Amino acid sequence: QERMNILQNFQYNDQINTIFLSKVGDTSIDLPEATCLIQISSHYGSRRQEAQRLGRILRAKRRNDEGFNAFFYSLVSKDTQEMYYSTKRQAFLVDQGYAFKVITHLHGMENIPNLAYASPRERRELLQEVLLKNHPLIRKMY
Amino acid sequence: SLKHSVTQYLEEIPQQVQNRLYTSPATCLAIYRILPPLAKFFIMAMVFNENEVPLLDLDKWVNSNGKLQFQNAIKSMKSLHLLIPNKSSGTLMINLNPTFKISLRNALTGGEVQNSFGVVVEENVVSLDLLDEYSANKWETILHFMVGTPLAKIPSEKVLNLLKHSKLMEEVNSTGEFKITNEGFQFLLQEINSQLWTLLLQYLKMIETMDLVDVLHFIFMLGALEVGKAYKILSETQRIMLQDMRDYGLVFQKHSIFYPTKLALMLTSDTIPDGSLIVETNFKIYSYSNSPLQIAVLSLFVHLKARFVNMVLGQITRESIRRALTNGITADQIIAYLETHAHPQMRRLAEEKLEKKLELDPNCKEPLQVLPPTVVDQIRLWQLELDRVITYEGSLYSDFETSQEYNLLSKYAQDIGVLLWKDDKKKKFFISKEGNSQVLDFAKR
Ligand code: BEF
Ligand SMILES: [Mg+2]
Secondary structure, three states: OHHHHHHHHHHHOOOOOOOOOOHHHOOOOOOOOOOEEEEOOOOOOOHHHHHHHHHHHOOOOOOOOOOOOOEEEEOOOOOOHHHHHHHHOOHHHHHHOOOOOOOOOOOOOOOOOOOOOOOHHHHHHHHHHHHHHOOOHHHHHO | OHHHHHHHHHHHOOHHHHHHHOOOHHHHHHHHHHOOHHHHHHHHHHHOOOOOEEHHHHHHHOOOOOHHHHHHHHHHHHHOOOEEEEEEOOEEEEEEOHHHHHHHHHHHHOOOOOOOOOOOOOOOOOHHHHHHHHHHHHHHHHHHHHHOOOOOOOOOHHHHHHHHHOOOOOEEOOOOEEOOOHHHHHHHHOOHHHHHHHHHHHHHHHOOOOOHHHHHHHHHHHHHOOOOOOEEOOOHHHHHHHHHHHHHOOEEEOOOEEEEOHHHHHHHOOOOOOOOEEEOOOOEEEEOOOOHHHHHHHHOOOEEEEEOOOOEEEEOOHHHHHHHHHOOOOHHHHHHHHHHOEOHHHHHHHHHHHHHHHHHOOOOOOOOOOOOHHHHHHHHHHHHHHOOOOOOOEEEEOOOOOHHHHHHHHHHHHHOOOEEEEEOOOOEEEEEHHHHHHHHHHHHO
16 A cells, blocks of 8 residues: 555655665566666666566657657666676677777766765765664463 | 878978989989879979969969968979079069979889889789788788787797887887887778878988988889789899898788788779777677787777687677776877777767758757767776875975065966966965976076
């Protein structure tokens, strides 16, 4: 019931435009309104889940208007095994024909008023926090 | 770049040597064609009149629009000392070199030429069957040895020595092998005309004590000759020079009479495609080319997996790209090769892509990208990966008694451009090994 309420409001409410789904909505869900897809955490090298997740935005309602191009973001940390797994989980999309564009920088990022975890003090606090993450009558007696 | 390179080499020559170089009409006919059209027009105007014309009269001919071209023409003509400026009676009179004038007059009017262009034996041979095959095979052998593919008949010690002593084809005996360089890849990217001119220019610079004027006599006369006909045999130096030129696949000898080949005429002037290829988003290359030279050059930055008669199929991989980059090849050069050997299908699809881009937003004229941007991004990213670690050789300066002295030394290093890093709080800085001696001397003084 709660997830259905979330979906209905994210669909028809003008106030809400973005949601944070998880592995539950990876496949076999029809979202005619969904248009943009972002991945911050991925299930290792799963190539099938890569395509299933991409499938959610392939049926966007406004997928025929001139000049429309859906977006699929994959955030990965450089100089880590996350790059290994990221390059391993897109070998099926590359085979199909889809090509990923590497974005080194997003222009105009500094002009945003507030950014999460912008201060080194908060960085240190988050560092410590994340590191610390790991006889029916006798019935009356009782 | 052809005329520019030849003109630069001819400009670097001394005037004393140029005056003797202009003796033979054969050399003059070749040098004349290389100059800009305006310079050629002025030279033709001056050749037929035995008088002196002021520079202002020449300036009058050029329109206001071509005034810029007039400056380049006059500068180029004066650089080679072709026009001798004589100032007298308050006027900067301009005159042509007498030797150049007489040579042009003889060539054009069929005057005495001293057989500079050679003679004819009237004993013709089959050009297509023998000349074409011989030159094609020999040029293929040299280019194959350059690209590094195995080949049985290795090139002669003459051309091998020229290659090593030139920047082309860096070799080391300790490694015991020869590898291509950045200039080597650029040479392979250049056209046949420039490919021949590069080697000939390197030979010209290599030769020492065989006269410099004689070498140009022979080369320009060879350019004058026409393929498919005999030419009886000349200078004593030119005999051994002809034998050496036979090693480059330009002139064919029976084993008394020498015959120019297609490359001889190619030297003078210029003159689906083979080499056109398709690049897919899967980092796959399909080149509709049937030539071992093209296959070998593609192997530099392509991990070949198979081949067919009509085409060659391969895959781009980090290993192959790193091999090509380690050889000194630039991603710009690689993309230039791919762009100039793009398939008509790729070109048409890219034209449609540009048309769609402009139709969507015609205000901005986006560049024409024949191949997908992802491949370019990946290649440049791999180059950045190779460039990730940066190291310098030098020494660190610290333990400075006075901040004034520290600032003085650091500022001197910055002024002479040998400063790489500094820190005022620590009063420390690092300088390049090249500038270490200069910094030490300044510190002592
Ligand atoms: F059920 Be489908 F493939 F989204
Ligand atoms: Mg379904």
